[PDB]
Design an enzyme around this catalytic site. Structure first.
Site, PDB file in Angstrom:
ATOM      1  N   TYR F 105      46.851  64.709  42.238  1.00  0.00           N
ATOM      2  CA  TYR F 105      47.733  65.756  43.033  1.00  0.00           C
ATOM      3  C   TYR F 105      46.895  66.947  43.368  1.00  0.00           C
ATOM      4  O   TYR F 105      45.939  67.228  42.656  1.00  0.00           O
ATOM      5  CB  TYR F 105      48.911  66.214  42.285  1.00  0.00           C
ATOM      6  CG  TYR F 105      50.037  65.235  42.236  1.00  0.00           C
ATOM      7  CD1 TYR F 105      51.031  65.062  42.917  1.00  0.00           C
ATOM      8  CD2 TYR F 105      50.196  64.268  40.845  1.00  0.00           C
ATOM      9  CE1 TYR F 105      52.117  64.295  42.822  1.00  0.00           C
ATOM     10  CE2 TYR F 105      51.312  63.634  40.804  1.00  0.00           C
ATOM     11  CZ  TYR F 105      52.275  63.591  41.728  1.00  0.00           C
ATOM     12  OH  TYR F 105      53.272  62.654  41.496  1.00  0.00           O
ATOM     13  N   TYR F 144      49.464  56.944  38.357  1.00  0.00           N
ATOM     14  CA  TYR F 144      48.650  58.072  37.745  1.00  0.00           C
ATOM     15  C   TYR F 144      49.055  58.316  36.223  1.00  0.00           C
ATOM     16  O   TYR F 144      50.422  57.840  36.038  1.00  0.00           O
ATOM     17  CB  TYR F 144      48.693  59.308  38.146  1.00  0.00           C
ATOM     18  CG  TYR F 144      49.813  60.044  38.478  1.00  0.00           C
ATOM     19  CD1 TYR F 144      50.447  59.877  39.658  1.00  0.00           C
ATOM     20  CD2 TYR F 144      50.279  60.965  37.737  1.00  0.00           C
ATOM     21  CE1 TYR F 144      51.422  60.393  39.932  1.00  0.00           C
ATOM     22  CE2 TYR F 144      51.710  61.466  37.767  1.00  0.00           C
ATOM     23  CZ  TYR F 144      52.198  61.391  38.921  1.00  0.00           C
ATOM     24  OH  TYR F 144      53.266  61.852  39.662  1.00  0.00           O
TER      25      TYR F 144
HETATM   26  O1  LIG Z   1      54.678  65.065  32.839  1.00  0.00           O
HETATM   27  C1  LIG Z   1      55.696  64.837  33.496  1.00  0.00           C
HETATM   28  O2  LIG Z   1      56.621  65.211  32.986  1.00  0.00           O
HETATM   29  C2  LIG Z   1      55.592  64.095  34.910  1.00  0.00           C
HETATM   30  C3  LIG Z   1      54.364  63.855  35.230  1.00  0.00           C
HETATM   31  C4  LIG Z   1      54.111  63.147  36.500  1.00  0.00           C
HETATM   32  C5  LIG Z   1      55.301  63.020  37.486  1.00  0.00           C
HETATM   33  O3  LIG Z   1      55.134  62.421  38.466  1.00  0.00           O
HETATM   34  C6  LIG Z   1      56.550  63.245  37.025  1.00  0.00           C
HETATM   35 CL1  LIG Z   1      57.855  63.017  37.912  1.00  0.00          CL
HETATM   36  C7  LIG Z   1      56.673  63.915  35.592  1.00  0.00           C
HETATM   37 FE   LIG Z   2      54.906  62.760  40.479  1.00  0.00          FE
END
Ligand SMILES: O=C(O)c1ccc(O)c(Cl)c1
Ligand SMILES: [Fe+3]
Ligand SMILES: O=C(O)c1ccc(O)c(Cl)c1
Ligand SMILES: O=C(O)c1ccc(O)c(Cl)c1
Ligand SMILES: O=C(O)c1ccc(O)c(Cl)c1
Ligand SMILES: O=C(O)c1ccc(O)c(Cl)c1
Ligand SMILES: O=C(O)c1ccc(O)c(Cl)c1
Ligand SMILES: O=C(O)c1ccc(O)c(Cl)c1
Ligand SMILES: [Fe+3]
Ligand SMILES: [Fe+3]
Ligand SMILES: [Fe+3]
Lengths: 200, 233, 200, 233, 200, 233, 200
Positions: F105, F144
């Protein structure tokens, strides 16, 4: 919904009903005690009457194998449920149509008045159940008297029949048989002047 | 006085609704966070009031006469009270309350816009007979909106309370009507995890008990905790 | 395993419970005989006491729509099951919390000692059943007296509660109301000082 | 005046109830014994009245105000009128009549013991809009006993009348309510031989159209005979 | 084959049809505007006539709860579909039979000739839809006039009836009522002289 | 100014993910303990911003040019925005954000080892057309790793924000890709109790919309709360 | 019952929401036109105010990644839905909490009064929607002003909250920032003094 045990299904009595319920008629020896067409003994209170009729099919033909069962109150408008040959009066009787003339007869008394469930008096009447080959489930009817015009006019039962013309099918016609008071109640199972039959 | 001569089958808390059932918003703040403490049954728990000598009015069980005639579907609500062993529960107290035909309750706190029925109270009581039978005569209550989610509606229901032979058996429940489409949508009903259990709260149309040209009938049997004699204690 | 008929599932009393079980409270006309909050008449043996309390939710807010049922022995430690308004003492009663103040009250006598199934004495107690909207299945609790500390200490029931501190939640606090002996018993449905609730 | 420009899909007389349906007692004496004579569609049959200029009162469609508030379940009955091809039927006349909450009808001949509701007439009319939609506000009717068999009860229902584009489309039916257990026992419902046809008369609960803390809603779509242009005639 | 959406199934109008469609008849207060039995205002062009009839069941008994709908052309043989109480003539009307006498009435004008789809003129006629309890699906019929014998003879519709004897069932009989031109059109649902009913 | 002329179908809080979904770690501390308070819709809730006059850049919706050419799978992400009634939602704001091909990101707080793409930003916006259609051109994001359980990985997803006609309809969600094996393993996906609801978030491969020898395409339709006119209020 | 198409299911905005909705915040280049925290231009009528607050999690820890959207009427109590950067006032805005301080700010005017559906005036308020990682579905709340006690008391919305203590959670505390009128409105997602969240 809630469903109970289903009632045993009816079946026509067939043409030989007489062997089981009208021994004499079948041309068979009768037993000691038989349920027959003499509801009242001579010494029975009330107006002694003779009832007779014919049964007609839809073609206007006599139904010569019909079997009839009657239920009526005594002269005091009371139902004598304890059946006994010793009784001066029995509320229950049996009759059948002659294979010849095709006419049934009954010896009884004109029934007294009884009230409906809501306490309203019903016109004097005799409850009839008709059985025969061709009849899958017995037909229920009532015999009323033409000389009870006033009572008849007010019967809560007679009044349930929408068409007045139909009410007339239930009224037996007073007559005399060998100088005795009789009422003729013919039943028309079908067609012109078809007798009113009930469900209860 | 009462005597400790019976044991009652332990309740199935997976069958009955749990305390915390978040869709029923009110249960959140009104449910314990600590586990219930189990205790053996003693006379304190296996006894209870017997209402045989309560002086009941003539129409205590007739909601049509106990408060004109109310406007609404005339019905008879009847059934039997038995225990888990199938044994009738005689001379047991059965109380009921419900809204009127529009879903309006005759209670100071009810602000729903449907009007009150000048001839309807909504309360009845009946003592089961020798065979565990009870019956009420009333009008079918209307569903009603309540402040849960933004569009929540209680299915038509009748509140019931049953004493049984002991405090261990005492129960408060609700009767729902066969085929009511609101039933499956209710957060209160849904407090019950098991669908089989929900079925047990559904009164069935009972034509055999109806008074032709008069009123319909519903059948609602109630099952209280099975009662047995103590053995090898 | 053997399975019996399942018990009818419980459902919350709802906010209008009063209509069916606390008529006066609902602000509706009462019937000739009502099951209420006066277990003992003035001439009933035993020490006459007043019971009062408030019921709290998880947020520490008063539950003003609660309904309570009580069951206790008489002063001789006897459970009088034949409920009758004519009786000097009834073992059973009903109470509810005010819509305003939110406090319930009960008029009775201090219960005598009863033995558990093992024949061991239980400290004087009142059995309580709590009902209200938000409560799916009623809560069972017991009210003990602070003035019975000796008895309390030996209670086979109190002793089942693992944590001493939780035991305290069941002890009513003796007070005086109009120079009358009273005991305050506040119920805390959830959170800090959460009242012990039983299963049996 | 009207123009003979359309043809209507021929009615399926096995889909609709037959004239002679013995269980519905009255049908016996009131059913022809001769077969119907089929006739080609003419201007006489393919035209009908247009009620656009009928002067409807403000509450013609609101049974809650068109007669105090009535006692009963406040409901919205809404839907759409379309033809067999799924084309909307705009500006068409929809008329309805029903019993009150107790199953009592405000008609001379109704002698049922359920009382009249002083604030309930039970008549409504609505002209479908541009999109074939209509809506009524009323109270859910209660079932009622009738002199057919000894224990007959009509399911709660609303009577409907729909004009459509011509006298060929004009129809009178009854709306029934979802989950009503009386439905399958009704000799009048049963005049309809196909169960699938029966389904078409059942209004579905419609939470989407309800007014929270006010009234519920039912959806009843009506399908009129398909309208097509004449071709190669 | 291609299957369209099925048309909503018909149901009998029931005994209480009046409440919805003949308010005045149901003995109820009417609304500002009602669709009734007066198709033509006095000042409407054409021959002003009165129509009346009785409806009989298979037993020859009056059908006192019938509901009728009419559709006819104006004097010019034009169908005026734009319904307005303001109009001098409306092509549409409604009537019902009295619960007493059991006779309906219609105040209209004699319809002008209308051509069928194939360009052949039909005899003057009024289209009728009959509704009532006991009638699952409404009955369609046509009223022709006995004083249009010449035209009736060539009616392509009338001519579709196989048996000439049955054609007579659709011919209303001219009379006078209070020195006014009237036509009596009795409908026999079933049996002897059973009226022709159409499907289209 | 805006006017309160509409009502919005009540949200199904059992369809949407609940607040407390323990497997999604962060949710534990970020979920309320008290029930939501239901309130009737007013002008405050049934209105919202209209972005028709927002001055959008030429490549606001083209992630391939809005920041060389990025590395990764060229794809168009298109669909339609409709309400529960199946009505298109024209001129509504659709905003999206996602990671790069490596699942990186372009945000300070992202410390995942996958490199940033010098030609990739990750932000798009598009106003839906008159038919409720929107479209984006971007590269397919990579899964990820996230600090939830010891080996948690977000399925490839694109974050979406949709305005709709009011604040009542406004929604944030995530698009997933048809066939991705990580889907069923994601605790975030799993916050949604109903498998059927999950399906609604899966963008389907759309060969019909792909640009031969250029880029593939995915179809992702969005349904917002059904909007209806007030009635009998 | 009737079922519509199901609404697309919500998903948490996640920690990188800023990249899509708070560019400046994500520390990325903004576009020509951005939707942000300045609803009012200096020259906008009404009382210009500064809104500020923090967001706490259930542990009392700052939520530094929250994203908020606001909807409010203008000083005249009118909703300006036509969003335009040229507007002196916009009814809609967006803000987020600093990753450092963890506080959000908004520049607007005090909202005029609007009536609910029933025609009853609501106290001045700002509608808020809170988004953040850990939040599956955004939370809805209202911001009321401490200096409108009169109005607050009558709010048909505020009055829908059962417990009066909970109502306080919605009241912003007026303060001054650099001699500028400000209101602090802190949100407690969970626990002690948990903010009221709505469903509509
Ligand atoms: O750490 C989190 O809560 C987290 C990380 C990445 C992601 O895409 C979302 Cl929706 C939440
Ligand atoms: Fe995300
Ligand atoms: O002829 C008949 O109807 C017939 C004959 C034999 C028999 O057993 C029965 Cl039930 C009927
Ligand atoms: O039944 C439950 O879900 C339950 C019971 C007790 C308790 O403390 C919690 Cl957090 C949950
Ligand atoms: O608010 C409540 O908890 C509520 C309202 C109505 C009702 O019937 C019940 Cl059981 C509960
Ligand atoms: O539909 C029927 O069953 C039907 C129709 C006409 C007719 O004369 C008879 Cl006997 C029966
Ligand atoms: O008697 C009848 O035929 C009858 C009675 C009530 C009713 O609703 C209908 Cl459709 C018919
Ligand atoms: O949804 C849940 O599980 C939930 C909601 C509120 C609340 O206080 C608790 Cl303990 C649980
Ligand atoms: Fe035989
Ligand atoms: Fe209730
Ligand atoms: Fe009816």
């Amino acid at each position: 919904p809630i469903e109970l045990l289903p009632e045993t299904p009816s079946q026509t009595a067939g043409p030989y009903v007489h062997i089981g319920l009208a021994l004499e008629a079948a041309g068979n020896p009768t037993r000691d005690q038989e349920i027959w067409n003499r509801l009242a003994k001579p010494d029975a209170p009330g107006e002694h009457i003779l009832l007779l009729g014919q049964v007609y099919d839809g073609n206007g033909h006599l139904v010569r194998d019909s079997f009839l069962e009657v239920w009526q109150a005594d002269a005091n408008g009371e139902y004598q449920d304890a059946y006994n040959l010793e009784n001066a009066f029995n509320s229950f009787g049996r009759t059948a149509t002659t294979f010849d003339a095709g006419e049934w007869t009954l010896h009884t008394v004109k029934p007294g008045v009884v009230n409906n469930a809501a306490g309203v008096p019903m016109a004097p009447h005799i409850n009839i159940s008709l059985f025969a080959r061709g009849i899958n489930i017995h037909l229920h009817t009532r015999l009323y008297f033409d000389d009870e015009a006033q009572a008849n006019a007010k019967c809560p039962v007679l009044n349930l029949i929408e068409q007045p013309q139909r009410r007339e099918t239930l009224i037996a016609k007073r007559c005399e048989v060998d100088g005795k008071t009789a009422y003729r109640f013919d039943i028309r199972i079908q067609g012109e002047g078809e007798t009113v039959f009930f469900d209860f | 006085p009462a005597q400790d001569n019976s044991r009652f089958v332990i309740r199935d808390r997976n069958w009955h609704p749990k305390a915390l059932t978040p869709d029923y918003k009110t249960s959140i703040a009104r449910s314990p966070r600590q586990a219930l403490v189990s205790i053996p049954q003693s006379i304190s728990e296996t006894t209870g009031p017997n209402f045989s000598h309560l002086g009941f009015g003539a129409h205590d069980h007739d909601l049509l006469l106990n408060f004109g005639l109310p406007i609404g579907e005339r019905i008879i609500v009847a059934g039997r009270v038995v225990d888990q062993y199938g044994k009738p529960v005689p001379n047991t107290l059965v109380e009921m309350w419900q809204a009127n035909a529009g879903g309006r309750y005759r209670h100071k706190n009810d602000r729903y816009l449907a009007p009150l029925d000048p001839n309807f109270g909504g309360v009845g009581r009946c003592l089961t007979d020798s065979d565990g039978y009870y019956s009420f005569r009333t009008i079918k209550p209307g569903p009603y909106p309540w402040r849960n989610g933004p569009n929540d509606w209680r299915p038509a229901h009748i509140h019931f309370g049953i004493s049984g032979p002991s405090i261990a058996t005492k129960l408060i429940t609700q009767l729902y009507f066969e085929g009511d489409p609101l039933i499956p949508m209710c957060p209160i009903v849904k407090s019950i995890a098991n669908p089989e259990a929900v079925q047990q709260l559904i009164a069935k149309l009972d034509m055999n008990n109806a008074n032709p040209m008069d009123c319909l009938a519903y059948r609602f049997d109630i099952v209280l905790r099975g009662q047995r004699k103590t053995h090898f204690e």
